[PDB]
Symmetry: D2
């Protein structure tokens, strides 16, 4: 079992919603976990980002509304013997982050609206690290405005795979993603 | 300091030829270090891949012809106290590889030719993992051929960054890079 | 000489600010000249869009503030004997637009601000076609907003070219460009 | 009806196989038709590239094996009153090009193997223009080798559209295409 992020999708329980391995390698690079650091993983999903954060030696709380997804998250905590360093929390951000200890880092997988970012600026200790991925055009202008307001690094990421087609190979149909890496 | 690959380019002595931090994350994700595994790093440059591979628990031999770049590799060995774990060899592949112990993984950022690959193909223990980045049409073609012959994974990767443009921002002008990841 | 848009950049007097030939093809495709239709070309530069629009049978008014660039527009008018069909106006939109007859189509390669668009929105006959290229994060955001408000088509476009790289070839480093095409 | 290439897909009879409008704008830009010039459109499909070549004032022969596709091609000749400037030919290249008059330009939509390119170099008058689009990795290395051997322009083209997803917008999943524009 690998000592670095980007571990296969199949290292995790998940439905058809999971940060794909190369994106997750990028995401963890930007999160930059130090040992014992806390992360709020807003979005959650399969919790795979949290899992790699914890395997790098971090502690993580992983917020997620959907019940089916929370089961997957929980299986992944057990599978990696991650209690109590990682906690699944069933809820919806920002509301679900009201009664939680302040973190050193925040990952906005999913749920990234202005209301979230207003609350975050209201609730978080200055210099708390933020990392966000956006796949919609609306999420993208949001990350672009955040980068205008507060600086940081803003990356545009395109990754495709080679695949069958049908006696030949093609590039898999790809979407770019924006990622913002900043503070506060 | 960060517990995962893709640390900033300033965490390393380098001369301008370093592997960019997000690409370094992707590569290490493909290399997938397990504790104590050995890496051949062909085309060391400033040795950043090897440093992050060894920081994840591996050992590495780093092959670079240029004495001035070797010196930077040496500093990174020093900085991170990796001398038990990490060796520099001044030289050219394939000649410099000939008396080395066989690795568990190989990385080619260096001058990857068909010669190098035929030699690697003859020498390597079956199941040894290979990872290569290409940034020329000629080396990309080569990876695609390698992929057609041997399988594994072939990724096309484009990463840009938000850069100044007068009082405006613009995407930095990037090249896609091809990355093959296979074995044997 | 070629009967379609996207003629080489050498078929025009220009100063370095010209629209690239493949982008000029895409733009004219979006503009879709019918015989005798009128174009407002905001941000003329060297007037290449207008030249190709008028060569397809249209008429155009070309708006550029810089006297030295106007001179290049003038040469292209001369070269192609377009003076009955094509006018240069030295100035800035929106002021320079105020006494012009209303067009059948408008192209903004020029300084496209929200001001310009509010004014264009008030002045223009409903069904007038609009086409804009963006190369900054700020102008791209604007196009996306325009798209959300008004519909039409929004394309993301990346074009690179095979360039030397020592004795090897590599892709030239390009930016994506956003292009909106709508009406009213 | 527009005086330039890139006309909508729906301006043509076609099954689910047709050069998409922006690609076709690019393709015709590179073909550069002059009035009365002959084109072999190898591939054929719906014949849309031929149709725009002829509407620019060119003559075209359009080779295509599949019977269903040839009906579409023929409907497009009738619809645009293109007889006899455009001829549908049911066959398979290179064989199907044995008894045909020599052209000024060649478009390799589909069917682009080495056998084709060996025959073409054997059958065509020096300085005959070639334009080719490739979507597979094998077709791409072929166009890359052709560019090594004979120069010309080699472009990498990525175009995406904005589209629903589901209360938001996404970029449509896109494949890059290589296009070679050369001679002989
Ligand atoms: N307001 C909100 N707060 C928290 N999570 C939300 C949310 N809105 C949507 N989500 C969740 O965000 C997830 C999408 S992202 C899933 C991928 C995940 N990052 C992974 O690595 O596995 C969905 O599971 C969705 O239920
Ligand atoms: N035949 C060969 N054998 C070993 N190294 C080579 C080589 N040809 C070129 N190289 C080296 O490969 C380097 C380019 S790649 C440098 C990036 C490196 N992976 C890093 O992270 O720092 C150059 O320094 C060059 O000297
Ligand atoms: N407010 C404004 N009104 C009109 N033109 C403007 C403007 N601001 C900038 N421009 C012009 O827009 C040009 C950049 S775009 C040049 C490309 C042009 N379409 C061509 O094919 O040649 C510059 O020359 C600049 O002077
Ligand atoms: N050897 C060959 N010779 C000629 N046509 C071929 C071929 N192999 C495949 N084709 C055809 O090439 C077509 C794919 S391309 C279709 C898009 C077309 N360029 C258009 O603009 O409408 C298919 O119709 C296929 O039947």
């Amino acid at each position: 079992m690998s000592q670095v992020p980007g571990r296969p999708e199949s290292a995790f329980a998940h439905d058809g919603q999971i940060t794909k391995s190369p994106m997750r390698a990028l995401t963890l690079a930007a999160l930059a976990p130090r040992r014992g650091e806390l992360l709020w993983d807003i979005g959650g999903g399969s919790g795979s980002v949290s899992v790699e954060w914890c395997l790098a030696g971090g502690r993580a709380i992983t917020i997620e509304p959907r019940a089916d997804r929370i089961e997957n998250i929980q299986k992944n905590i057990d599978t990696y013997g991650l209690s109590p360093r990682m906690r699944a929390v069933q809820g919806t951000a920002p509301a679900a982050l009201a009664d939680l200890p302040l973190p050193e880092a925040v990952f906005i997988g999913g749920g990234g609206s202005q209301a979230l970012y207003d609350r975050l600026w209201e609730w978080l200790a200055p210099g708390t690290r933020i990392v966000a991925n956006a796949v919609t055009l609306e999420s993208e202008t949001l990350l672009t405005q955040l980068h205008a307001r507060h600086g940081g690094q803003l990356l545009r990421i395109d990754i495709a795979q080679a695949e069958p087609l049908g006696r030949m190979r093609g590039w898999s149909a790809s979407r770019p993603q924006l990622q913002w890496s900043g503070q506060r």
